[PDB]
Paper text:
By applying the proposed strategies, we have resolved the structure of the dominant hIAPP polymorph, formed in vitro at pH 7.4, to a final resolution of 4 Å. The enhanced ice coverage and the abundance of monodisperse fibril filaments observed with HEPES buffer facilitated the determination of fibril structures formed at physiological pH. Notably, over 80% of the particles corresponded to the same polymorph, with only a minor fraction representing polymorphs with longer crossover distances. The resolution of the reconstructed 3D structure after Bayesian polishing was determined to be 4.01 Å based on the Fourier shell correlation at the 0.143 criterion. The final map presented clear density for the majority of the peptide, which enabled the construction of an accurate model. Cryo-EM results also undoubtedly show that the N-terminus of aggregated hIAPP is outside the amyloid core, and instead forms flanking regions that are exposed to potential interactions with monomeric rIAPP. The double S polymorph observed at pH 7.4 is consistent with previously reported structures from both ex vivo and in vitro studies conducted at pH 6 (38,66).
Residue numbers in the entry:
A (entry chain J), B (entry chain H), C (entry chain F), D (entry chain D), E (entry chain B), F (entry chain A), ...: 13 to 37
The structure:
Amino acid sequence: ANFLVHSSNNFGAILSSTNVGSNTY
Amino acid sequence: ANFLVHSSNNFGAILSSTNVGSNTY
Amino acid sequence: ANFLVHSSNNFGAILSSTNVGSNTY
Amino acid sequence: ANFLVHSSNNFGAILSSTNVGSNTY
Amino acid sequence: ANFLVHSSNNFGAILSSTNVGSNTY
Amino acid sequence: ANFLVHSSNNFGAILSSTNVGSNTY
Amino acid sequence: ANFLVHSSNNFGAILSSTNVGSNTY
Amino acid sequence: ANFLVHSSNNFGAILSSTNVGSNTY
Amino acid sequence: ANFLVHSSNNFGAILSSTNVGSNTY
Amino acid sequence: ANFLVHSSNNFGAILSSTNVGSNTY
């Protein structure tokens, strides 16, 4: 619901997707 | 719902997508 | 709903898209 | 609905798009 | 609906587009 | 030295900085 | 030396920095 | 030396840095 | 020397750094 | 020397670093 993310020198991706339906990446 | 994100030197992407339907990336 | 984002030296992208329908990136 | 964004030295893009329909990027 | 954005040294773009239809970027 | 850049629908930034000293972004 | 870059719908950043000294991002 | 880059829907960053000295990201 | 890169829907980073000295990421 | 990279839906990073010296990641 309420996500706490701290990053440093991020080269890739951060996925914090809370899903109730369908999806593709 | 209410997402707290702190970043530094972000080169990539941050995805915090809360999904109820469908989507593609 | 109400998203709190703090960034510094952002080179990429921050996606905080709350989705009820469909979309592509 | 009401999104609070604070940035500094933003080189890329910040997408806070709340979607009810379809779109492409 | 009512989006609160604060920025500093913005080099890129900030997209806070709330979408009900279709669009491209 | 002589940089050839072609762009279209640029939302972010393009950095082609050739550096001999120090700098921060 | 002479860099050929073609882009489309760029949301982030393109860094083509040729470095002989020191720098930070 | 002469780098040929073609991109589309770039959300992150492209680093083509040719380095002879030191640097940090 | 001359690097040919083609991308699509890049969310992270592409590092094509040819190094003769030292550096950190 | 001349590296040919084609990608699609890249979430992480691609490192094609040709090294003659020392470096850390």
